[PDB]
Design an enzyme around this catalytic site. Structure first.
Site, mmCIF file in Angstrom:
data_model
loop_
_atom_site.group_PDB
_atom_site.id
_atom_site.type_symbol
_atom_site.label_atom_id
_atom_site.label_comp_id
_atom_site.label_asym_id
_atom_site.label_seq_id
_atom_site.Cartn_x
_atom_site.Cartn_y
_atom_site.Cartn_z
ATOM 1 N N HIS A 179 0.613 -1.336 -0.034
ATOM 2 C CA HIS A 179 0.155 0.075 -0.186
ATOM 3 C C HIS A 179 0.957 1.486 -0.127
ATOM 4 C CE1 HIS A 179 0.268 -0.255 4.374
ATOM 5 N NE2 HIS A 179 0.529 1.091 4.326
ATOM 6 N N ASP A 207 0.270 -7.957 1.527
ATOM 7 C CA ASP A 207 0.641 -6.580 1.554
ATOM 8 C C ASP A 207 2.187 -6.358 1.627
ATOM 9 O OD1 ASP A 207 0.741 -3.739 1.772
ATOM 10 O OD2 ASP A 207 -0.046 -3.595 3.755
ATOM 11 N N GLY A 263 2.818 6.632 9.416
ATOM 12 C CA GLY A 263 4.235 6.857 8.960
ATOM 13 C C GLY A 263 5.061 5.677 9.136
ATOM 14 N N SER A 291 4.208 2.314 8.131
ATOM 15 C CA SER A 291 3.738 1.489 7.359
ATOM 16 C C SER A 291 5.120 0.832 6.436
ATOM 17 C CB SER A 291 2.918 1.907 6.451
ATOM 18 O OG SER A 291 1.510 1.689 6.789
ATOM 19 N N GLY A 292 5.268 -0.230 6.122
ATOM 20 C CA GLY A 292 6.459 -0.983 5.454
ATOM 21 C C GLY A 292 7.760 -0.984 6.252
#
Ligand SMILES: [Ca+2]
Lengths: 222, 56
Positions: A40, A84, A174, A176-177
């Site tokens: 995402h 994801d 902030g 995410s990932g």
């Protein structure tokens, strides 16, 4: 990261910041030319920033490298959030103690395993406060049962919950990932949740151990 | 009218800056989008926002 602590400059050498004019997602360096993050977080014009601590001031240990390719998992579902995961190829190889890659897992981690989560995301559960420096959090992996109890009909075999049912400690916007590292191996990718640090709503992470062969082969043929 | 809906960050944990039409202020403003499950009052630029929702 809500309820965490300041990691200390370059103590998480594999942490990267994805920048599109500002920090919007984190990621993990798995080799000199590849970064793994969340699907995402896909965006055009991504600049990857390595060796960062204070993301707002140039401190000297940075390496800003543009992405040449962004590969989102072929089965990523934007509605269910299943699969994801995304791979980002750097336009040039990074120069690897302040910048180093993180190892992929040989096996999946079990409930109870303590892991390190890091990021420059929001530090407030009720409010907004983005840090300059990298924040860290130690949280345990939760059992599949409790994860499914917290998010009925939303947890797939490619997701795991980590955190505290009491709330107060969690990842947030902030983050995410970013990485979820346990025993020196990358086990998860910050993905989603219901708010941040809410009681009975732990964060949900992409289960990296299920994608190792896909990651290795994809990296090799690109 | 989706132009009258409050902005929706969604469940994902990114910090992506997007635009939404704020009918009270009569303009498009920025908000933090999490990266997934966007509702319709969510635009990549102020121009797109004004074209779609302006004057709602
Ligand atoms: Ca810096």
């Amino acid at each position: 990261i809500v309820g965490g602590y300041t990691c200390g400059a370059n103590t998480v050498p594999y942490q990267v910041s994805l920048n599109s004019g500002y920090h919007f997602c984190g990621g993990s360096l798995i080799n000199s030319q590849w970064v793994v993050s969340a699907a995402h977080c896909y965006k055009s014009g991504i600049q990857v920033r390595l060796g960062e601590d204070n993301i707002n001031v140039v401190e000297g240990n940075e390496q800003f490298i543009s992405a040449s390719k962004s590969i989102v998992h072929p089965s990523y579902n934007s509605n269910t959030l299943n699969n994801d995961i995304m791979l980002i190829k750097l336009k040039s190889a990074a120069s690897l103690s302040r910048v180093a890659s993180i190892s992929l897992p040989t096996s999946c981690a079990s409930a109870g395993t303590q892991c390190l989560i890091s990021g420059w995301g929001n530090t407030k559960s009720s409010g907004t406060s983005y840090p300059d420096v990298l924040k860290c959090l130690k949280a345990p992996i939760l059992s599949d049962s409790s994860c499914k109890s917290a998010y009925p009909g939303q947890i797939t075999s490619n997701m795991f919950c980590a955190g505290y049912l009491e709330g107060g400690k969690d990842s947030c916007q902030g983050d995410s990932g970013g990485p979820v590292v346990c025993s020196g191996k990358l086990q998860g990718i910050v993905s989603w949740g219901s708010g941040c640090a809410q009681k009975n709503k732990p964060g949900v992470y992409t289960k990296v151990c299920n994608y190792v062969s896909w990651i290795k082969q994809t990296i090799a043929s690109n | 009218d989706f132009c009258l809906e409050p902005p929706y960050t969604g469940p994902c944990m990114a910090r992506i800056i997007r635009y939404f039409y704020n009918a009270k202020a009569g303009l498009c403003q920025t908000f933090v989008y999490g990266g997934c499950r966007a509702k319709r009052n969510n635009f990549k630029s102020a121009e797109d926002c004004l074209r779609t929702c302006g004057g709602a």
